[PDB]
A paper describes a structure:
Fungal immunomodulatory proteins (FIPs) are a group of low-molecular-weight (MW) proteins investigated as potential anti-tumor drugs. In this study, the impact of glycosylation on the bioactivity and biochemical characteristics of FIP-nha (from Nectria haematococca) is described. Taken together, these findings indicate that glycosylation of FIP-nha impacts its thermostability and digestion resistance.
The double-glycosylated wild-type is denominated by WT. However, we only managed to obtain crystals and solved the structures of WT, N39A and N5+39A. Specifically, the composition, as analyzed on SDS-PAGE, visualized that the double-glycosylated band of WT represented only 6.7%, while the single glycosylated and un-glycosylated bands accounted for 31.7% and 61.6%, respectively. For the simulation, the GlcNAc2Man9 glycan structure was used, as this high mannose-type glycosylation modification is commonly expressed in P. pastoris. Figure 3 shows the obtained crystal structure of WT and its predicted glycosylated form. N39 is positioned in the middle of the third β-sheet and located at the four corners of the tetrameric structure.
Residue numbers in the entry:
A (entry chain C), C (entry chain D): 4 to 114
B (entry chain B): 4 to 113
D (entry chain A): 5 to 114
Write the structure that this text describes.
């Protein structure tokens, strides 16, 4: 459970690097509804896309919003859930889809 | 570049490690049809399942065949493509699905 | 071929990560003398130490100077070289020393 | 959960097997560690080993030949001037990456 060997592999591999995937869940007009997810600074080395899983159900992948001036990127669950937000009773999982190999890495989970 | 720092990080966590994901593509009744995939020694720390993508198209996930006594495991594309094999013209991608987080890692491509 | 899986392992392990190990080599009173090295933003999860080898010769390990307000950290080669700087003619390697396991990772190299 | 790192190693090298499970060899008075044996080492590089005995750096030595079964042995008599290391003392064994000079801990005694 000490990954300093992994950390400095990245240090040696990419001399400068900075990211922040701390989840910011945006609520909706009835507050019991989660409408979106916001990352403060996303990785930009590749055009990543996002897949949303609502309570086990695959909502698919959709075109990504542009990374904004502060480095943030937003996932709008209304794009995935047919114009609706996801109830807070339900579990939400968000994966990044690597465009090069098609891999998927879990980057946010609710409940 | 040089990923020995990643190898010896795994060495520190799991002293023992052995795998072989060399793709063995088995052809079908016309030799131009790919029917299955065999990995000589798969990882067994978790019950992995497989996802198959035929020329960009998601064929989904299916229950996995048992890991054989020699460590092998077989992906039967007839299970994923409704009993037919994939033509050598099409691209096929096979992902391992981590049952813990739902991650997907590509382990074979034609 | 593609280490995005290692990046996103780190996203999962530590939501936020930010570093810059771009070498800023500080020259000395004769311009051909390299007296110190500064990293703009170093990793701070442990009090790392640094080992300097001057042209294959081990000058040893020394305590780090405190991480500065801007996150930078500097290695002063005079602490390693008996009060004198290293000529820019010779090759310099700087290793990070993980204080918990004693591992050593190369983070900067000159000429 | 580090499966994402594991399938990175799979992706890069289809086939790989190693075992650094420490096998400590005792000495003529049993209160002595004479050597360490790794059952199957990585051989993609000529790694060397550095020993630290109770905080003391004993340096690097040429590595013993990798044996037919894939093993490699570190002989503490080579590092400790023809003597074994008392078990009361701490032993650390680092692999030296010959390419960058990195050092990764692969064995530790008490």
């Amino acid at each position: 459970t000490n990954d300093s060997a992994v950390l400095f592999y990245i240090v040696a591999s990419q001399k400068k690097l900075s990211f922040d995937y701390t989840p910011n869940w945006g609520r909706g007009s009835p507050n019991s509804y989660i409408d979106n997810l916001t990352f403060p600074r996303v990785l930009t080395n590749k055009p990543y896309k996002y897949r949303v899983v609502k309570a086990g159900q695959d909502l698919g992948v959709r075109d990504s919003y542009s990374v904004q001036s502060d480095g943030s990127q937003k996932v709008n669950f209304l794009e995935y859930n047919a114009g609706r937000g996801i109830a807070d009773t339900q579990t939400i999982q968000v994966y990044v889809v690597d465009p090069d190999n098609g891999n998927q890495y879990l980057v946010a989970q609710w409940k």
